[PDB]
């Protein structure tokens, strides 16, 4: 089952971090992924990206098949940009498409650029509930507050914006069991069957994930919910010893790459 | 018959908030009878549901069903023709509707199974005229609509395409008092014509009234299994495994209490007025 | 009257027809009162125009006052901190990621100091008998369960205005009993109004006041023994009568008359003692 967006209960010790200092060690570490320019500097990127991935206690398996179908996005995207973009040396060329060595390299890089974002998007979501999650972006967003910006409904949006994905795959398990249940048959044929058996579904899935998610706004408001403003907290939201893990983090990791940089 | 033997579901197996749903399972249900699926909320009924037609498979034992053997290593390949013979509505008829209107929701069904056009649009007129729905809403959206509205279009749309097996996850929730007696009549009327009824049920009334066979159920485990006389026989045991008794069982008991003793055991509503004229001539 | 709903019009949405039409009722401060009616009768879309999530088609002849405030635009947090509205669905209730951190979103918005919120969520998830399920994530629960989570994030609040939009369809009839003793206590002690949508005439029965709705229109309003006598009225609509009156009439039926004074099960047990002794 996809584990984006979705929060799964655990009680390694980043599940006690902040979620102020996860918000911005994620936002950190995603501005460093933009920063490797050496294949050393986005090696070291890659055991960071891994340690933080097992640092929150999911067994690799679980992890993996949670991460499984953007993981396979993410490498025909960065396929695709290996074929389009080619320099140096040439390997086949064959047809309009080709394969070129500085080609491959920039794949890799892509491909590992965006993994690792969402590697880490991945660990943010999962170890934080979804309206700490928002909390933590209207926190973030203070300064912000000038200018008269209503940072609330931001930070709202932001976490309807992350609760959409795990919606849109909850809806995709309803509604292919409702059909399933009822006679449809998602596993016959050819790729083309299967396609054209799953097409009617498209306008359902995301019409279904948008109305739950505008339901959820529905039942904070029905609840009193009129802000984030003057509102008390049922769980404690305070720094702690732990807090200070993710900035030798994020202070290590920085070290790391300004000595392995390419400048 | 419906076999199930040492039949257990877990959810989430691997997670530490691993819970059994379903724990060693061993019954069989006889075809063509009306079959109460009791117990307290979160015994495992919609589990056990849910694993009539195949939508979960079990952790571990063997169900045996309508031709098909289900395993903890089947897949979803090939269950087209159990779901054929076999059909499930939902708990909630939100989980089951997805068409745009009432009449194409009610039709997707008899379309996946030979249903030409003319056929399918008879049949879902016929089954939404019999769940009581007016003629003006078949070409509303399923959402459109209020929950009792909702509960009837998803039974009109899983008996639309006459399966042998019809398994019922409180169909009778959310639907007023007319329309909760009307389904009950379909329903039997249903299993007069032939075919198997399981009704997962939360009022021992519809029991006492409709099952012919009784399946009760406790944190997974199957407590019982028998005639709704032998399960409402004593009312100690009900109490103690989180179920009730028949409103006419304890208008007996209570009659009984205040000193007008009742011959045998009354569990229907005429079934006591008899009982108590009875006492009184 | 802690509720006035004078004139009132909601077409949904368009829709041909209005849901409620010209509808005019008044809720009894401090009673029970039973709102019963067929299936798609605008009993769940009373319930969400009085929360204010809906609004009336013509806002300046339709009045809704609760407790004194005139529901509206400039009103509406004014009224929802008065009013606990448990949904039909129990999955459009749920807020929080586990079953304590949904009972004390409410508490959390009425600025409730945590020390207090503790006790009181941990107090509210044992009443509903959920005290085990309190870490789990509410979506992976029963219909029951989810049910009595829902009742519990509305009854942490203590509202002064309760409204169970068929709140006990779900529930076990141990659960049942359980969940409406303790509404019934949780009313009597904090001195609240019940507002109990519902299809079970067991319940209407035993409520103060039981109004009636038929498309969307107030058809009748009165006390439960002056309402379940109306047979003819109640079977024309999609209704029934409770298991007492339906005793009665099949024991008419059968010989044996017994007078219409008696509403209870207690009564009909002494009238048929009584009979019996003779
Ligand atoms: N998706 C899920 N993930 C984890 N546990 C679940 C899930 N669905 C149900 N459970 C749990 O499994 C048990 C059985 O649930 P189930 O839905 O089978 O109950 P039920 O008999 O249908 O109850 P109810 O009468 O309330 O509908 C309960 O303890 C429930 O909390
Ligand atoms: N979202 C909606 N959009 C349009 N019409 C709706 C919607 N929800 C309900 N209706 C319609 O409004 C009317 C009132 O239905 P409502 O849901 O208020 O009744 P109810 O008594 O709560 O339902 P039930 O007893 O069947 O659970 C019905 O005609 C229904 O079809
Ligand atoms: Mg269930
Ligand atoms: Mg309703």
Redesign the interface.
């Known amino acids: 089952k996809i584990i984006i967006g979705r929060y799964?209960?655990?009680?390694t010790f980043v599940y006690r971090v902040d979620p102020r200092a996860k918000l911005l060690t994620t936002f950190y570490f995603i501005i460093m992924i933009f920063l490797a320019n050496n294949w050393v500097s986005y090696l070291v990127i890659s055991i960071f990206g891994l340690a933080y991935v097992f640092a929150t206690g999911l067994?690799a398996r679980?992890f993996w098949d949670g991460v499984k179908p953007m993981i396979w996005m993410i490498v025909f995207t960065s396929l695709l940009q290996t074929f389009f973009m080619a320099g140096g040396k040439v390997y086949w060329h064959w047809w309009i498409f080709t394969l070129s060595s500085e080609g491959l390299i920039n794949g890799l890089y892509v491909f590992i650029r965006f993994a690792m974002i969402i590697l880490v998007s991945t660990v943010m979501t999962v170890t934080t509930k979804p309206l700490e999650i928002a909390d933590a972006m209207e926190w973030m967003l203070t300064p912000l507050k000038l200018f008269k910006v209503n940072v609330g409904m931001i930070s709202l949006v932001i976490s309807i914006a992350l609760r959409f994905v795990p919606t849109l795959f909850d809806q995709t398990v309803?509604?292919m069991?409702?059909?399933?249940?009822?006679?449809?048959?998602?596993?016959?044929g050819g790729l083309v069957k299967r396609a054209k058996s799953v097409v009617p579904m498209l306008v359902?899935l995301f019409i279904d994930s948008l109305e739950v998610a505008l339901d959820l706004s529905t039942a904070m408001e029905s609840r009193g919910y009129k802000g984030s403003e003057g509102r008390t907290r049922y769980r404690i939201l305070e720094w702690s010893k732990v807090d200070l893990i993710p900035v030798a983090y994020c202070l290590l990791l920085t070290i790391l790459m300004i000595t392995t940089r390419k400048h | 018959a419906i076999k199930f033997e040492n039949v257990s579901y877990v959810?989430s197996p691997?997670?530490?908030?691993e819970a059994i749903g379903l724990d060693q399972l061993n019954f069989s249900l006889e075809e063509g009878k009306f079959i109460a699926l009791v117990?307290?909320?979160?015994s495992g009924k919609?589990t056990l549901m849910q694993h009539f037609?195949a939508?979960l498979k079990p952790t571990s034992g063997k169900i045996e069903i309508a031709g098909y053997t289900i395993t903890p290593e089947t897949?979803?390949?090939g269950?087209?023709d159990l779901?054929?013979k076999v059909?499930?509505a939902?708990?909630?008829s939100?989980?089951?509707?997805?068409e745009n209107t009432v009449l194409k929701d009610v039709e997707?069904?008899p379309r996946?199974?030979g249903f030409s056009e003319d056929e399918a649009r008879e049949a879902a007129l016929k089954w939404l005229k019999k769940v009581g729905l007016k003629d003006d809403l078949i070409e509303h959206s399923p959402f459109?609509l209020?929950?009792?509205?909702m509960?009837?279009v998803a039974l009109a749309?899983?008996l639309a395409?006459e399966p042998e097996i019809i398994c019922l996850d409180?169909p009778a929730?959310?639907?007023?008092?007319?329309?909760?007696?009307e389904m009950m009549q379909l329903f039997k009327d249903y299993q007069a014509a032939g075919h198997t009824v399981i009704l997962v049920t939360?009022?021992?009334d519809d029991v006492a009234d409709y099952a012919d066979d009784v399946l009760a159920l406790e944190h997974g485990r199957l407590i019982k299994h028998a005639s709704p006389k032998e399960v409402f026989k004593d009312s100690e045991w009900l109490q103690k495994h989180?179920?009730?008794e028949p409103?006419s069982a304890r208008?007996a008991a209570?009659?009984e209490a205040?000193?007008?003793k009742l011959p045998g055991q009354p569990l229907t509503?005429?079934e006591?007025?008899?009982a108590?004229?009875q006492?009184?001539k | 009257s802690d509720n006035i709903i004078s004139f009132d019009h909601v077409t949904?949405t368009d829709?041909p027809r209005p849901a409620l039409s010209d509808l005019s009722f008044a809720i009894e401060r401090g009673s029970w009162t039973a709102l019963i009616?067929?299936?798609?009768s605008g009993k769940?879309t009373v319930s969400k125009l009085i929360n204010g999530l809906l609004a009336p088609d013509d806002l300046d002849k339709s009045s809704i006052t609760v407790d004194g405030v005139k529901l509206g635009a400039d009103t509406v947090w004014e009224v929802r901190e008065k009013v606990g509205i448990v949904f039909?669905?129990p999955?459009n209730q749920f807020v929080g990621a586990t079953v304590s951190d949904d009972v004390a979103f409410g508490l959390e918005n009425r600025a409730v100091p945590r020390p207090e919120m503790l006790k009181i969520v941990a107090q509210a998830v044992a009443d509903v008998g959920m005290a085990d399920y309190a870490d789990?994530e509410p979506s992976?629960?029963?219909?029951?369960?989810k049910q009595?989570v829902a009742i519990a994030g509305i009854l942490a609040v203590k509202p002064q205005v309760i409204i169970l939009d068929?709140s006990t369809?779900?529930?076990?009839?141990?659960?049942?009993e359980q969940i409406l003793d303790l509404v019934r206590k949780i009313k009597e002690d904090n001195n609240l109004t019940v507002i109990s949508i519902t299809?079970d005439?067991?319940e209407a029965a035993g409520a103060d006041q039981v109004l009636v709705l038929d498309d969307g229109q107030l058809l009748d309003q009165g006390k439960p023994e002056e309402i379940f006598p109306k047979v003819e009225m109640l079977?024309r609509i999609?209704?029934?009568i409770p298991?007492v009156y339906?005793?009665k009439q099949?024991?008419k039926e059968?010989?044996?008359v017994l007078p219409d004074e008696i509403d209870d099960?207690?009564k009909?047990?002494?009238s048929?003692?009584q009979?019996?002794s003779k």
């Open positions: 799964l209960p655990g009680t067994k679980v309803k509604i069991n409702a059909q399933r249940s009822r006679g449809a048959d998602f596993n016959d359902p | 959810y691997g997670s530490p908030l117990g307290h909320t979160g919609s037609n939508l897949g979803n390949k269950l087209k779901r054929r059909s499930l939902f708990q909630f939100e989980a089951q509707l997805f997707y069904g996946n199974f459109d209020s929950g009792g509205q509960r009837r749309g899983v395409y409180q929730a959310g639907l007023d008092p007319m329309g909760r007696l939360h009022n021992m989180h179920l009730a409103r208008f209570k009659l205040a000193g007008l509503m005429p006591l007025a008899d108590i004229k006492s009184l | 949904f829709s009616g067929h299936n798609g769940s039909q669905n999955d789990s992976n629960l029963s219909g029951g369960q009595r068929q369809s779900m529930l076990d009839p141990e659960g049942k299809h005439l067991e079977k999609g209704l029934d298991f339906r005793l099949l024991l059968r010989g044996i099960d207690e009909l047990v002494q048929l003692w009979l019996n």
